Amino acid sequence: KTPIVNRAITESEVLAAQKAWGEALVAISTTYDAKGKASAKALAEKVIDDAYGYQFGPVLFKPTLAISPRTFRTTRAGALAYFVGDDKAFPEDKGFALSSWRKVEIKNAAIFITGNTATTMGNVIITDKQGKATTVDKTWQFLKDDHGKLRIITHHSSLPYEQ
Amino acid sequence: LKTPIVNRAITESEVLAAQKAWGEALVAISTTYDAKGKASAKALAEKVIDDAYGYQFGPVLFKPTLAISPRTFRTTRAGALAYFVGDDKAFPEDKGFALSSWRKVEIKNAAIFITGNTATTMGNVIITDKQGKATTVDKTWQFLKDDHGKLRIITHHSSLPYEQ
Amino acid sequence: LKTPIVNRAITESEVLAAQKAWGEALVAISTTYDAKGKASAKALAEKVIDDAYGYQFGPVLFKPTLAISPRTFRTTRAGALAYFVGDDKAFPEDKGFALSSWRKVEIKNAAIFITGNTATTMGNVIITDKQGKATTVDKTWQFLKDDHGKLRIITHHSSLPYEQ
Amino acid sequence: KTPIVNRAITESEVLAAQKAWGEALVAISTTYDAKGKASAKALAEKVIDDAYGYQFGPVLFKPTLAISPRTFRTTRAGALAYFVGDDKAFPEDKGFALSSWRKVEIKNAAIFITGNTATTMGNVIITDKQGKATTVDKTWQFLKDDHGKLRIITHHSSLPYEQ
């Protein structure tokens, strides 16, 4: 067979990358419940380095609940603080992944594969141990890096507008 | 003499001009309404959405600030037009966002990412009306440089900044 | 139902179809000459170069097998047309490469590289004429997927394989 | 100022990358003349790893003088053998950089910047210590890697056709 490099992104990789984020989120919440804040922040570090692209510079991360002075988490620390708190630089961050998440559903409205990047926009539904679901409007942009792994370079999350 | 060169990549200069042009279009739609009525404003918005968005390519990932849950995502040109100027019983909740007598637009980017052929910005946009009332949104834009060298919006996530 | 999806990336399937279509065009130009004359063949090549090359975007990086040093690089549609069908005193050395009664085309890729929106192939192409004489070239192609989803040749380096 | 990642390629980087290849070629030829085959093959290794993209898989390298059975050097070894010989797997390769090169001129006919890759086509003129110039028709494709460095992923070189 002919040797082929493939920097492009398929629809399959996009949907895997998206699922992988949910696995990562639940793993943090799960770890927090069983092993406490220490192991879970350790976990979330390997997650953010794996799933995000703070390697390349700023990530365009606007988290659902971030507040005016630190709305955009362009730093690896900004993301980790959103996910697990415990960073006096983000006083208002209690740790979004610490809410005992157990299930994540991705509901895409549209996907745009623009060469070696891909963008999804849709809903994400995260449900906890007691069944309380939360719903965000979400835009993800993945970049396929030199090693063939998708990396989050844009992450805009917002609470659905209501009346 | 100069080497002939085709350049499909986007430059920072191109991105910033594109954000600027959007704001200029927004105020043009609002200003045409106040000065010429719904018809002339709706007509301008059609040319605007056709010029600055990429619906030609397929869906645009447009999630507007104040769209409601059955029609959160405006993947259709008619969804984008309806959000801006209302007047479409297919989108009954749409009063016409661009009709609020807007007069100034301010782009404060927090980060820019040029993926080569595309470019994403994320930051704040601050629009202010005839009487000086300012609205701030958190916005993510994605611009594609088309075969003709024009940047088009293929992604547009707007949201009210979270509070309390 | 299916998620609406815009796909600007090139797939291996798309690349191979594109190489195949070029060979099919080549034999169509040669076969139209033998069966209809220069005029009909030149007319076909115009549609061919317009369909399969990307001169619309600017220069195409076309270096043909047997072009000579003042006009080595055919960056112009007229250069590409002249190389294929001659008949252009602007390119006096051009007898019309596609007029040699070609009948079969074989693509043997050595490597394929999909850069996302574009794709490059490098390998051999073996074209054979009405009487069974085969010519082998070392070819590099670059295909761009245009806003309409059609792969276009923006790079085309052909060369005689080196000997002794 | 606003933080910005820039995977794109500029015209300036293309022309720098091209010059850098020539520097690399002359460095090998120069080293060979003063320090022999050992230091120069060592040099050419760091060059091919630096300038080429055999990291990502096959490079589309068709060298000027490669012969029918091994026309395409899709392997790091294939390139090194073209440049400095000394590899029983490429018997016919005497080492193209071993010819005491001193000057390299790049004469571009066209450049195509297709996002985060760029393609040049033109002439290259390489002249040796005695002034004997050699002229190739050359196509280069550069990929800007996760670290911002251009890498050769396509390299088609051919002797100009004559009568």
Residue numbers in the entry:
A (entry chain B), D (entry chain B): 43 to 205
B (entry chain A), C (entry chain A): 42 to 205
Which passages does the manuscript contain on this structure?
To further analyze the metal-free catalytic mechanism of COG4337 proteins, crystal structures of Bn86287 and all2909 were determined. The substrate (bicarbonate) and inhibitor (iodide ion) were found in a bent finger-like cavity of the cone-shaped barrel. As expected from the biochemical assays described above, electron densities corresponding to metals were not detected in the cavity. Notably, Lys180 in all2909 was found at the analogous position of Tyr224/388/552 in Bn86287. To evaluate the functional importance of the cavity-forming residues, we performed point mutation analysis, wherein Thr106, Tyr124, Lys180, His197, and Ser199 were substituted by alanine in all2909, and Thr486, Tyr503, Tyr552, His584, and Ser586 were replaced by alanine using a recombinant protein of the third COG4337 domain (431–607 amino acids) in Bn86287. In all2909, the substitution of Lys180 did not affect the CA activity, while the other four mutations resulted in complete inactivation. Considering that hydroxyl groups of Thr106/159/322/486 (residue numbers in all2909/1st/2nd/3rd domain of Bn86287) and Tyr124/176/339/503 were found at a distance of 2.5 to 3.5 Å from an oxygen of HCO3- and at a distance of 3.2 to 3.7 Å from an iodide ion, these hydroxyl groups would most likely mediate the deprotonation of active site water. The deprotonation process could also be assisted by the main chain nitrogen of Thr106/159/322/486 and the hydroxyl group of Ser199/258/422/586 that is positioned within hydrogen bond distance to Thr106/159/322/486. The results of size exclusion chromatography with multi-angle static light scattering (SEC-MALS) system showed that Bn86287 exists as dimers but all2909 exists as tetramers in solution. Analysis with the PISA (Protein Interfaces, Surfaces and Assemblies) software estimated that a tetramer of all2909 was assembled by a head-to-head interaction of two dimeric units.
